[PDB]
Amino acid sequence: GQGEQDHFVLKSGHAMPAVGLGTWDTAHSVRTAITEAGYRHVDTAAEYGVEKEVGKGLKAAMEAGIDRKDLFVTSKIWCTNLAPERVRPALENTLKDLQLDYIDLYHIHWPFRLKDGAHMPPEAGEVLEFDMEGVWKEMENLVKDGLVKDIGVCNYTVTKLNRLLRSAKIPPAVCQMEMHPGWKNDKIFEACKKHGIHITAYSPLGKNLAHDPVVEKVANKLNKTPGQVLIKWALQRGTSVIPKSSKDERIKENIQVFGWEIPEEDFKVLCSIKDEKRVLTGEELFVNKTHGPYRSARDVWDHEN
């Protein structure tokens, strides 16, 4: 509650480290974040195109004494593979690049299907229909076959979430969303809360909150960096957090968020910042203001923002 929990227990019972290295020189970074920073949770995605490097970083850290069972690895299936018959092949390719025989968490990157070779923004005929139920069924099979410990989703809405639940035999263990003082997304958070779905916040620094005087003033008082405050904010909010950084020093700092906390007043401050700083609207690759099927950012978020 005081953002002092270093891990969260998923609905399946599996423990997931509160802080994870975001991967949005990846090998070195991963290896170092684990062996020197103390990281045990690495978040990645096939879409980024760096899994191969993450795998190399993971192999080195393990050959260095870190047990596989002590690591929490997450990946995401990209939009072009959001079709029942493309789920298995996508995950297996993920396991190959990461050089693992299983992953801990596997998310649906975005709840939209895209045609192979689609553009940003998407042209007409590129954002295909999404058989959410058929795809999730296949995701559940990954869990049953022991290749994935937990499945989850990113960038969802209450509407899509509810739809997902009206047929899920295995509830999503985690819901990963953009979260920070600029955009708290209380709504989807509240929906996750009631259903016992854990929440992971991404893009902790935001529209750079690390340079917002409000955050800076709190960081000066606490004598921490804006990034640490922002990350601790997420923790005290009760969500795991995956900060994106490419420097070992920032990476080391980002996990040095235990042993202290943000006074309720300051925490009140950061929370009372009006939600108007949403970085990932989804317009870049899903909006087509004319032919659709999503002719606006609001459609992308079911007009529930």
From TrEMBL:
Its EC number is 1.1.1.21. The keyword tRNA processing does not apply. The record marks K76 as: Lowers pKa of active site Tyr. Residues 19-271 form the NADP-dependent oxidoreductase domain. The keyword Transferase does not apply. GO terms for molecular function: oxidoreductase activity. Keywords: NADP, Oxidoreductase. InterPro entries: AKR, AKR4C, Aldo/ket_reductase_CS, NAD(P)_OxRdtase_dom_sf, NADP_OxRdtase_dom. The active site is at Y48. Pfam families: Aldo_ket_red (PF00248). PANTHER family: ALDO/KETO REDUCTASE. Belongs to the aldo/keto reductase family. This is Aldose reductase.
